Amino acid sequence: QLFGMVAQHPDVLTGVRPNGLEDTPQFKIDIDQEKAQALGVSISDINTTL
């Protein structure tokens, strides 16, 4: 929204830009606790392996 406002009034501000990085797709590994406990596998083992 601030960048949209700074797009207006170009006579005072020029070349405004972020100093960071835009969001990127990330891969989410979701562990089902019920299934993990149903098997013999332990959360510490899963996280350590991954």
Place this chain on the structure above:
Amino acid sequence: LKVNQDGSQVRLRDVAKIELGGESYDVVAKFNGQPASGLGIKLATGANAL
């Protein structure tokens, strides 16, 4: 927390009361009898108070 012999599961709700409270309950402050909180600032050694 665990799953019983049958399909019943034991959550943290079943054995506890989860609420968002203070880290410690020892210190309690009031201002003119009204509830309040505060900060007690102590000056660093060899620093100007003003």
